Amino acid sequence: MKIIKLYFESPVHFGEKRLSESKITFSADTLFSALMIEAVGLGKEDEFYQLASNNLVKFSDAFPFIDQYYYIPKPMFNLKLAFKKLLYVPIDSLEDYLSFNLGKLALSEKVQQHDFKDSEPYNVGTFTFKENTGLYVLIEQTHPLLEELLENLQYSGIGGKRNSGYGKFKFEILEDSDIEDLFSAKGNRKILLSGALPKDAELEQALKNASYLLERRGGFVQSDTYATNLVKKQDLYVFKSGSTFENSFDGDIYQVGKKGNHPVYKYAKSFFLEVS
RNA sequence: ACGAGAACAUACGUUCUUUGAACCAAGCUUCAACUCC
């Protein structure tokens, strides 16, 4: 199981509800949406969907990482038992569990001027990473196709505010074996690592002793082909990445657009870190 | 088929107005056109 490390040399804007604020990381269907839009840039979008639909391409979402420390969101248990301010724990320090600051959020103030009229300002929330940090994306069984797409994505930009002028990155794989054995392990409680949602006939079996938050996950369709306007998406509600489940489930790539000239998918497949 | 798409933090605006590098202060003090043969 491989690593995908993302080094940003420019600020990022990962919006979650509005342009004025931003988020440290980006989700999994955000990266999958970027890969779909770039694959239909290359025309190979159909067999990329047939790869990601049949589990050979299965990635988690982005996580913070500092120099030789890979992080995850604080897994949230039914713990009966200060470190309550900390949002991220190192990925190998879960056994110890049972200082940290990457970057700083900034707000960039912009304007749009009209020539024979008064101007109008708008402001963009940004995030800038420190010099020896960034984000990393977990992936198992790397494919030549996704190695080609991320090689091609880095000149289009992950992030929100494009193409002015923020999201750009250079990636490298840099596989690791100190944390592959964590994912080869098996335990009794399995934490989630991506924004996921089980299929309708297994949500009950997935929902037994869980600890989760829903997140709304919608927005606008970003294409020049979906139905001659800016149509919103069917707001899918997926589990938060810092969830825990005692029993596993497998997600689906749900179609959240069913009215334009092409389908709009949303990645909601599961990715577990099994722990005792 | 990225809470996304499109968007100059832009337009206007004299580091400027008033202000003697001035005031006070002897080119002066002491000296033989001279001594010797």
Residue numbers in the entry: 1 to 81, 91 to 107, 119 to 296
The authors write:
The multi-subunit Type III-A CRISPR-Cas effector complex (Csm) exemplifies this principle and is in addition regulated by cellular metabolites such as divalent metals and ATP. Recognition of the foreign or cognate target RNA (CTR) triggers its single-stranded deoxyribonuclease (DNase) and cyclic oligoadenylate (cOA) synthesis activities. The same activities remain dormant in the presence of the self or non-cognate target RNA (NTR) that differs from CTR only in its 3′-protospacer flanking sequence (3′-PFS). The single-stranded DNase (ssDNase) and the cOA synthesis activities reside within the Csm1 subunit and the RNase activity resides within Csm317–19.
